[PDB]
From a paper:
There are two highly flexible loops present in the structures of TA_2799 and TA_5182 that mediate the entry and exit of the cofactor and the substrate/byproduct into the active site of the enzyme, leading to significant conformational changes in the enzyme structure.
The crystal structure of TA_2799 was determined at a resolution of 1.76 Å in the PLP-bound holo form. Continuous high-quality electron density could be seen for the covalently bound internal aldimine form of the PLP bound to the catalytic K286 residue in both the subunits. The protonated pyrimidine nitrogen is stabilized by hydrogen bonded interactions with D257, and the hydroxyl group of the ring forms a water mediated hydrogen bond with E224. In TA_2799, the side chain of L322 is not bulky enough to cause this change, and as a result, the phosphate group of PLP may not be as tightly coordinated when the PLP molecule is bound to the enzyme. In TA_2799, C324 occupies the same position. C324 is not adequate to cover the crater, so the crater in the crystal structure of TA_2799 is filled with solvent molecules instead.
Residue numbers in the entry:
A (entry chain A): 5 to 459
B (entry chain B): 3 to 459
Amino acid sequence: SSTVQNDLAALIHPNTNLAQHREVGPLVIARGDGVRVFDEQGNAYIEAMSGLWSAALGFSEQRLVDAAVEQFKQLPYYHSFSHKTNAPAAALAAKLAALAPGDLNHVFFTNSGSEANDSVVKMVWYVNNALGRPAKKKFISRQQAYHGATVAAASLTGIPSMHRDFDLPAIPVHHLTCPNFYRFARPGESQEAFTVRLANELERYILAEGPETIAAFIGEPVIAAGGVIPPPTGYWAAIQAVCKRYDILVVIDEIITGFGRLGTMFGSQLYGIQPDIMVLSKQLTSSYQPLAAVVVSDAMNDVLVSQSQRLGAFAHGLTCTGHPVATAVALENIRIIEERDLVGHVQHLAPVFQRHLRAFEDHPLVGNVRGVGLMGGIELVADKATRQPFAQPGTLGGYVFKQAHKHGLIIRAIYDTIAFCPPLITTQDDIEAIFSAFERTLADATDWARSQHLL
Amino acid sequence: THSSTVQNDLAALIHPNTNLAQHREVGPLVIARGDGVRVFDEQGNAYIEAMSGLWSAALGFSEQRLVDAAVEQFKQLPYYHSFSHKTNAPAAALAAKLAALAPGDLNHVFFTNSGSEANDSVVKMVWYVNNALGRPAKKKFISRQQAYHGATVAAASLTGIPSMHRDFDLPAIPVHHLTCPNFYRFARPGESQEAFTVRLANELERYILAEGPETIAAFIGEPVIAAGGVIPPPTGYWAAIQAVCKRYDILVVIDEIITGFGRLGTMFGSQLYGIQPDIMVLSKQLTSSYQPLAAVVVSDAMNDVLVSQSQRLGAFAHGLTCTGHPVATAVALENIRIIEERDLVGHVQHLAPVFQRHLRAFEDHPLVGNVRGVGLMGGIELVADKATRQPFAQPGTLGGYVFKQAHKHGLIIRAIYDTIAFCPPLITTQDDIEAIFSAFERTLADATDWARSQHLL
C-alpha cells in the first residue's frame, strides 16, 4: 500500500476535517531541508509556520540529530521515578533554571505542552491544599487562549471550537475578554483605555467570585493559535498588578513565545512579566523530540517538598518524564540558539519581516496587520470600514491555506487570519521568498473572494 | 564531591513519583548506560532491570535496530505535524500496522505522546461521540480501585490508586470506581474465583441500574492491574464484565499500555482473556520507551461518528503538536517488526512457565502472603501475618527496604507498597531469570533479618 492508502484506511488526523479527509486525502510530507519541506512527489514548500510554530532550527539541523544519536548509543531510555535520574535531564533542568527569570529555579518535565499545563493545574491545587487554602482552586484564562488539548489544558484553552461537543471547560475556569484591540476597542478608544477596561473586568470577576477561591491566571504573552494577537499597551503591567493583590499566581505559557520568537529569549522579558510559573515546549526541541517543561519558584518547590514529607511521594509523573534523548536534544537546541545568537538574529530580521507584513495594510482584502518579533498575522475581512468578519468564517482563510501550496508556501489560517511564524534560522533571502509567494497567493485569493461574492 | 549530574539534579530537577524531601538528603541515582536487560550507573555499578524500567523497555536498553530506525528517519524528516490533512509515511504505516494487529474492527488510530494523553483523548472522544448521537447525559466513566490510567487530570481521575488522588482534588471528572478484582484480598471464606466474578459483575450491574444506564458512557480497565499491585483478574471476570456492559450499551475501553505487545504471552492481553474492546489504548512496549508514543485504536462505529462530527463542526478539534511524530512512529514500527521477526511473543510463551515457577517458589516463605502473575509479569506480596493476610502497620516499609537493598545485589525491581513487582524485558533469557531470582533470594534474606531487627513481625 501507498502512504496515502495507509493513511486513508487507518489514520485519525488531529485538527483536521475528518469528513473532507476521506475525499481529498492527505498531503504526504517526506523530507526537510532548512526552512523547506518536500512532499512525496518532491515539490518544495517554504515552511513559514515552522510546522506548528515550533521548528526553531528548521527541518534539517544535523546537530540535533547528532545529539539524539549520541544519547541513543549510551542510554536510549530510562525513567526519573524513585530518585533515578540521567545526565541530560539534570543538565537541562539546570540550564532552564539559569535562563528563566527571577527565582524560577525548579523544573518538571513532560512530553507535551498539554501535559505541562495539566501538571500546572495539579501542582497549584496540591500546593494550595498543602497551604491550608483548599478553596483556592479556580483558574482564569481568556477567550482565544490556547493551552493544549488534554481535558484540563483544553479547559484553559479559550477557543470556542475546541470546546464544542467536548463538554469543556471540565474544570473551574473563567475566560476573560480576548485582549484584541482591533476587534474589541470602542470607537476612538486608545490602547491604554482598552487595557483599563480589561484590567477592571478581571478585578470585577475576582471580587464577585471571591479571591480566596481563585488560584491562578494563565496566559500566553502573545496569543498565537487564537489569531496572532499582541497585547494592548500596558496590559501585562495591569494584569500582574491585579493578580499580585489577590495572591493569584501568574502562569505564563511561553510554549510558542519561548526561545527568541519575539526578539527576547522569553516573551516575558519584552512585556515585563515576572511569572510565578513558566511553561515551555515546541522551540525547546524544535519539535525534533516531544518535550515540555514546567519551571516553578523556590517557594513552590518548598511546598512540593513539604508535601512529600507528609505524603511520602510526589504522586505525579509520566513514563517518559525526563527522557534522556528528548532532553539531550533540547540541551543541544538551546546551545545552538545561544552559540549562534539567534535571539540577536531575530532582532535583526524582525523589522524587515514586520515591514513586509504591514505592506499589505492597504490591500482590499486586509482589515488588520499585527505582529511582534518573528510572529505575524494578516487578518482578512469582508469590509474594511466596519471590520466585518466573513459570513462563514474561515472560508477565505481556508482558500489561502490551500492555494499557497501552489506557490510553494505553507502558512496557517486561523479562520480568516493568515499566520506567519518562520524558523528562527530564516534569512533575509528567505523572507523575500516567503512574501513573493504570499503576494501571488493573495492575488489569487482576491480573484477568488470577488468571484465567490465574499466582500 | 558529587558529580556534575548530581549537583545539577539536586539544584533544579523536580522528580516524578519520588519522595522530594528524601531526595534532598539521599540525592539521585544517575543511570548512565544501557546493555540489554541491564543498566549501569555513573559509578559503573550494574543492575539487572527486572522491571524493564517502567514496565516498558520491551527490547531492552541497547537495541541498535531501534537507534537505526530513528537515525534513518531523522536524516529524511526529523519533524512534521499531522494537522490540516498533513501526514508522514511512518505514522501512516504504523496506523495501518496497529489496525492489522488489533482485534475485531479496531481499525482507526489516533496518536499521542503518552498513555495519559491517550486516555484523556478517549474521554474526550467518548463525550464527543455521545453528544453527536444526541445522548448528552451519557458521559460517566466506570473504573476500578487500584486501576492506573495516567497522570493528567482526566486520566488520573480514572486511576483508582488513592495516593495518586490525595491533595490533587481528584477524581475531577464523573467516574465511579468498582471493587478491585483481587481474589486474594476480597474473596469471602471458601468462595471460588468464579463466584467472586459473579459478585463483581453484580456490583457493576447494580451501579448501572442505580445511576441509570443512559448516564453511563464507558468502562475502562487494564486486563491485568499492573501499577496497582500486579493483580490478574479472577476466573471468568472479563466475559462477565463485557456481557453487562453490552447489555447497557456501555463502551468497553481496554487499557493495554502495559499488557500490549506480548507481556502476557499473547500479542494483546485482550486475546488471553477473550476481551473485544470498543477502544484499545497502547503505549510503553509500543516503542520500548525509546520514543514517547501512544495510540488510541477505535472501532469503525466510533470513527464513523467522529467523521459525522467533522461534517457539521468543520474539524476534529483535538491534537498534540507531536501527534504522529515521524521519528517516534518510525521507532514504533521497527520495534513491532523486531517483536514479530524474533517471535518474542513465542519467546514469552516459553519463558513464562519458568518465570512463574520461580515466583511461586517463594509462596512458603515466612514473609510472603501471596504470589501472583501471568505471562512475564509477577508480584510477590509481603505481609505481616499469612493466616489473616494482614498488611503491615506502615504499608511500604518492607517493600521500600527491598527496593533499596536489591540494588546492592545488582537488581532493580519495583515495590508497590509491600508487593514486589517483576516485569523483565521480552528479550530476557532463562539465564537472566535465574540471575534475577538469585539476587532476589539474597535480598529477601536481608529483608527477613531486617524485618526481625526492626520488630515489624
